[PDB]
Write a protein that binds this DNA or RNA. Sequence first.
DNA 1: CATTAATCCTTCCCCC
DNA 2: GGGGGAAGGATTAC
Length: 341
Amino acid sequence: MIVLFVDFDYFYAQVEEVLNPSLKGKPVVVCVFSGRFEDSGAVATANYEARKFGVKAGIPIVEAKKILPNAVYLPMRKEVYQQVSSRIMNLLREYSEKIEIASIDEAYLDISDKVRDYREAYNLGLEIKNKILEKEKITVTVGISKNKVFAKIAADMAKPNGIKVIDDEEVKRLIRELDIADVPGIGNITAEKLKKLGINKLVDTLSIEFDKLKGMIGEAKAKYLISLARDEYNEPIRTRVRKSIGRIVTMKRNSRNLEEIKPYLFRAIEESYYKLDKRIPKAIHVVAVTEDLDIVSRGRTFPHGISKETAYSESVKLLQKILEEDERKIRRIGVRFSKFI
DNA sequence: CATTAATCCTTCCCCC
DNA sequence: GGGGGAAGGATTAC
Ligand SMILES: Nc1ncnc2c1ncn2[C@H]1C[C@H](O)[C@@H](COP(=O)(O)OP(=O)(O)OP(=O)(O)O)O1
Ligand SMILES: [Ca+2]
Ligand SMILES: [Ca+2]
Ligand SMILES: [Ca+2]
């Protein structure tokens, strides 16, 4: 099997560069203003200019302006990036019909039935990069190996504007010499549980009784990590349908007053129903981020799909339920819709 | 300071 | 005992 993964480079910022090319060369920071005080918010992403100086995603916009007061700061326009992403995906779609659009920025391609070895793969890689560069003026990085996970890892090593092949020989070496923390799916919390069990490389998973590993990190991750270390991992590249749509907003200020929070919530619902576009959910969840950044949520599945007015009144009850069951003030409020017909 | 969504886990619950 | 499905939370990653 030959898997080709494609990840677009500093994507939102690159798109903002593409739409106003003057930005090239300057440090560009795409960020999400939360409407509280001025420059309250976080960084969605930044280009490599900004990222050289520690300005990355998640950091507050205030920390970034301390570091790079004279960088260009731009509000996020996801719908634009979304439309551009769709178009790029369609190019890739003309190199295989076996394609998993994982996210706005990433896609994997099964090209087993197209090319025949890792050289031809490399060629296919360049001519795809070359294409997206021509057609859309966007830099991507390309990673190639025998499964999805190693193809993704390949790309992470290669970025930016890279291409890399991990042939069946280097996989064997990486099972031994790659940090478990650099495996897809192993966030902080998992990585620290694996150091405690004395697992710092992929191979050390074999060392331990399955049933203990299952205890610490769950069966599914255990099996995933085990299969990976045995050169046995091989999930198929499959299309994926969106299962959930929703939206959270930040309030100008924290609150527990029902009437103060309602309008934020109703706005969240309307934006959600527009985004649904002829999709009908049987389930609704109200989510709240509390003053100290804990997350609480309350849901309901219906035997039928949900009208807009039903969502309005049902959300208010669920919000009432959240307030009655947690005494903290609420910072962000929103909805998620799911279980489409 | 701190701005969408998938999948997994645990706990209930109903019931053969 | 165990299937099935719902709720609420935990974790990850973009
Ligand atoms: N923490 C975040 N908050 C909001 N949006 C994010 C966050 N992280 C990533 N994104 C968005 C912005 C990115 O342009 C896009 C893909 O992220 P990702 O591929 O991880 O990095 P990147 O595309 O910014 O640069 P690169 O791929 O070169 O690291 O998703
Ligand atoms: Ca990515
Ligand atoms: Ca990227
Ligand atoms: Ca990781």
